[PDB]
Amino acid sequence: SPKTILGIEVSQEPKKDYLVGDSLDLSEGRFAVAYSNDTMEEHSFTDEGVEISGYDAQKTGRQTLTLHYQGHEVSFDVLVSPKAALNDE
């Protein structure tokens, strides 16, 4: 049988931190969806169900963000910083 969802739960935390030449990379912005087959799935900045408005990818630095999904809206802030050393791959 097909696997679809029904109920949605907001589980995104404030962060939105991007490094120079790194572009977007939201990880705290994840949502938890409950399926009808008794299963839950979590993903950050993966699903295309949430649209962000106000964030300028062509210019970051203390920019406002507003995510809208279905009928809910959440506000957040983004801060861009210079890439650091020692990074795991």
Residue type, 38: D
Nearest to 83 by CA among 25, 24, 27, 21: 21
State the structure-solving technique: NMR
Dist. CA 40–CA 65, nearest whole Å:
26
Dump the DSSP string for the chain: ----EEEEEE---S--EEETTT-----S-EEEEEETTS-EEEEES--TTSEEES--TTS-SSEEEEEEETTEEEEEEEEEE---S----
